[PDB]
Design a binder for this molecule. Sequence first.
Ligand SMILES: CCNC(=O)Nc1cc2c(-c3ccnc(C)c3)ccc(C)c2cn1
Length: 205
Amino acid sequence: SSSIKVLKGLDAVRKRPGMYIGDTDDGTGLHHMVFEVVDNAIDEALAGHCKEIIVTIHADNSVSVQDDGRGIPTGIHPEEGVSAAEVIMTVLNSYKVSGGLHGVGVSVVNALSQKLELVIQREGKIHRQIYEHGVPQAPLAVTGETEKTGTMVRFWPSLETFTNVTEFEYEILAKRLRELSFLNSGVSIRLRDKRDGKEDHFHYE
Ligand SMILES: CCNC(=O)Nc1cc2c(-c3ccnc(C)c3)ccc(C)c2cn1
């Protein structure tokens, strides 16, 4: 079954996290977690659907990334038997430095997070799914109605994976988010730190 195979993938990531996300002891991997989530919101911006991305560092050391795009698709594709979103989130770099890392997908971020929450606003409805190291708590479900559209991912990195540098560095995220808004001109990126009230808005016209 997909369940056993999904778990086998998630377990591969957790056993050699460095290989997938980058170094787990110097902050490379930790901050790369944010950038992987951001990258898919950037693709949605570049295709002309999302105008703003908001990255928030919370006081409990989680990070959320939200966009105003179309929302990750929610329907169940006949081949997989669960939402397309859950497939994206769950189905599947050691010595790389900073911008030399290659992209590995948000299912890696999910595997290496103690908790992750996905909230999709799409087709008139608010949809929610929660994960613990990639394992959904329940099927993606409808929790309300909305005229808005977009996707939000919030994740709590696992301290079973990350050591030494365990708390996000505002300056690392600021530097790279600014570079990303330069490298993908037109897209507005905001960074908010709830620990100390700092905010920035990066946008090149
Ligand atoms: C907070 C992070 N934002 C998104 O992931 N936005 C996003 C992703 C989409 C993906 C997607 C998500 C993750 N990985 C991949 C490869 C695609 C597929 C299709 C649509 C319409 C999306 C819309 N918004």
